[PDB]
Amino acid sequence: RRSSCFGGRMDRIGAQSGLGCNSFRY
Amino acid sequence: RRSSCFGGRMDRIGAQSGLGCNSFRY
Amino acid sequence: RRSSCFGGRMDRIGAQSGLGCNSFRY
Amino acid sequence: RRSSCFGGRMDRIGAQSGLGCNSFRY
Amino acid sequence: RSSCFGGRMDRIGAQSGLGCNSFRY
Amino acid sequence: RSSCFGGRMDRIGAQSGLGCNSFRY
Amino acid sequence: RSSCFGGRMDRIGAQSGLGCNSFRY
Amino acid sequence: RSSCFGGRMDRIGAQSGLGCNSFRY
Amino acid sequence: RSSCFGGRMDRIGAQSGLGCNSFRY
Amino acid sequence: RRSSCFGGRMDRIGAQSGLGCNSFRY
Amino acid sequence: RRSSCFGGRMDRIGAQSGLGCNSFRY
Amino acid sequence: RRSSCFGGRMDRIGAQSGLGCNSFRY
Amino acid sequence: RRSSCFGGRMDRIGAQSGLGCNSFRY
Amino acid sequence: RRSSCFGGRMDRIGAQSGLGCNSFRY
Amino acid sequence: RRSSCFGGRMDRIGAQSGLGCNSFRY
Amino acid sequence: RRSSCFGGRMDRIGAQSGLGCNSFRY
Amino acid sequence: RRSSCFGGRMDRIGAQSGLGCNSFRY
Amino acid sequence: RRSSCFGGRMDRIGAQSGLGCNSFRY
Amino acid sequence: RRSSCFGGRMDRIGAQSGLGCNSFRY
Amino acid sequence: RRSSCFGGRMDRIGAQSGLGCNSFRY
């Protein structure tokens, strides 16, 4: 039973990436 | 039973990445 | 039972990465 | 039972990384 | 049985950023 | 049985960004 | 049986961005 | 049985950033 | 049985940053 | 039972990393 | 030019009552 | 020029009552 | 130029009542 | 130039009542 | 010159009256 | 010159009257 | 010159009256 | 010159009145 | 010159009145 | 120049009431 029955996940995100209400200014 | 039945996870995030209400200024 | 039934996790985060309401100024 | 049924975890964080309401100024 | 979850349960997971506003007058 | 979930349950998952507004007067 | 889900359940998943507005007066 | 969870439970997980606002007058 | 969790339970986990605001007048 | 059923953990943190309301100024 | 009690360039003048005080409930 | 009690450049003048005092409830 | 009781450049003048006193409840 | 009781450059003048006294409850 | 050339004023306010971001609970 | 050349005013307000972002609960 | 050329004023306020971010609980 | 050219004033305030960020509990 | 050209004033305040960040509990 | 009771450069003048006295409750 190599199962992964989870609820939520956020994997393999790119560089300089925002995940929610993030302000950026380059 | 090599299971991973969890609830939440945020793995393998990129460099200079924000995870929630983070302000950046380069 | 090599299980990992947890509730939350934030692993393998990139360099200079913010995890919540963090202010940055380069 | 080589299990790791925990509740929360934050492992393998990058260098110069903030983990909550941290102010930075380079 | 409820091997690793069961019964009543509430908010479970990894919240990231909750109610940290910004003001500038 | 409910091997790893069952019964009543509520918000479960990875929320990312909740109620962090921005103001500028 | 409900091997890994069952019964009543509510919002489950990965929400990303919820109610973080922007203001500029 | 409830091998590693069961019964009533509340907020469980890794919150990251909660209610640390910023002000500038 | 409740081998390593059971019964009523409350906030469990690793909070990181809670209510440390910043002011500048 | 080589189990590690704990409640919370913050391991393997990077260099110059903040873990809550920490102010930095380089 | 006399301008006994007003004159020249002028901007918002009066009694504003309630400006930008919103309400939030999550 | 006389400008007995006003004149020249001028800005917001008056009795503001309530400005930017919001309410939050999480 | 007389400017008996006002004149020249001027800025916010008046009786402000309530400015930027918010309320929070988590 | 007379400027019997005001004149020249001037800034915020008046009776402010309540400025930046917030409330927190965690 | 019985003049009253002012900028702002809030006079003759009633009892139990709020003047900006005031919370009441009877 | 019995003049009253002002900018703003809020006079003769009733009892239990709010003047901007005021919360009441009877 | 019985003038009163002022900038701001809050006169003749009622009993139990709040003037800015004042909390009451009867 | 029976003048009163002032900048700010708060006169004739009622009983049990608050003038800024004052908490009351009867 | 029976003048009173001052900068600030708080006169004729009522009984049991607060004047800034004062806590009361009856 | 006369400037009977005001003149020249000037800054914040008036009766501020309540400035930066916050409240915390953990």
DSSP code string of E1-25 = --SS--SS---BS--EEES--B---
Q: E17 — contact with chain L (CB < 8 Å)?
A: no
Assign residue C25 a region (left: φ > 0; alpha: ψ between -120 and 50; beta: otherwise): beta
Please name the helix (run of DSSP H) or strand (run of DSSP E) that holds residue G3, with its range, or none: none
N16 neighbors Q9 (Cβ within 8 angstroms) = no
If you search the block for the tokens 């800054």, which residue do you land on? Answer: T11
Expressed in Å, this structure's resolution amounts to: 3.3
CA distance N3 to chain R (A): 12
Q: G20 vs A20: CB contact, 8 Å cut-off?
A: yes
CA distance C10 to P14: 57
For the record, the structure tokens of O5 come out as: 């050339």
Q: What residues form DSSP beta bridges with F18? A: E18, G18
Residue in C22, I10, S5 with CA at minimum distance from that of residue R2 = S5
Structural contact between residues A21 and E21, judged by C-beta atoms closer than 8 angstroms: no
How far is the C-alpha of O22 from the C-alpha of P18, rounded, in Å? Answer: 8
- Decide if Q8 touches T, using CB distance below 8 A: yes
Indicate contact of T with B: 3+ CB pairs under 8 A.
no
> Which chains lie within 8 Å of chain O at 3 or more CB pairs, if any?
K, L, M, N, P, Q
Q: What is the CA radius of gyration of chain H?
A: 17
The residue in chain O having the minimum alpha-carbon distance to the alpha carbon of residue P24 is O24
Q: How was this structure determined?
A: cryo-EM
Nearest to E5 among H5, H13, H20 (CB): H5
In the chain, the amino acid numbered S22 is N
Alpha helices by DSSP H, chain F: none
S9–R9 CB contact, under 8 Å: yes
Between β-strands F16-18 and N17-19, what pairing exists: parallel, antiparallel or unpaired? unpaired
Dihedral over alpha carbons R7, R11, R14, R20 (to 10 degrees) = 30
Cα–Cα distance between O17 and M17 in angstroms, integer?
A: 13
Chain P residue with Cα closest to O19: P19
Nearest by CB: L17 against O5, O7, O19:
O19
Q: Tokens 């909740």 sit at which residue?
A: F18
Q: Using the beta-carbon criterion (under 8 Å), do T22 and I25 form an inter-chain contact? A: no
The Cα N13–Cα R7 span in angstroms is: 6
Handedness of CA T22, O19, L20, G18 (dihedral sign): positive
What's the angle, vertex CA O13, arms to CA M5 and CA L21, rounded to 5? 85
The DSSP output letter for Q13 is: P
| C9·E5 Cβ contact <8 A | no
Distance CA D23, CA T3 (A): 49
Cβ neighbours of residue T1 closer than 8 Å, sequence gap 6 or more: N1, N2, N3, T7
| C-alpha span between B11 and B15 (Å, rounded) | 12
- Which of H4, H12, H17 lies closest to D20 in CB terms? H17
Residue B10: closest C-alpha in chain H = H14
For E14, L26, Q3, T14, the CA distances from P11, given in Å and listed in that order, are: 53, 37, 20, 20
Side-chain-facing half-sphere of R11: CA atoms under 13 Å:
8
Of the candidates R25, M18, I18, which has an alpha carbon nearest to the alpha carbon of residue D21? I18
CA angle N13–N15–N20, rounded 5-degree value: 100
Question: Residue A18 is which amino acid?
Answer: G
Containing F17, the helix (H) or strand (E) segment is strand F16-18
Candidates M16, O10, O1, K17; CA nearest to P4 is: O1
Phi, psi (rounded to 5 degrees) for C25: -155, 105
Q: How far apart are CA P22 and CA M16, in angstroms?
A: 15
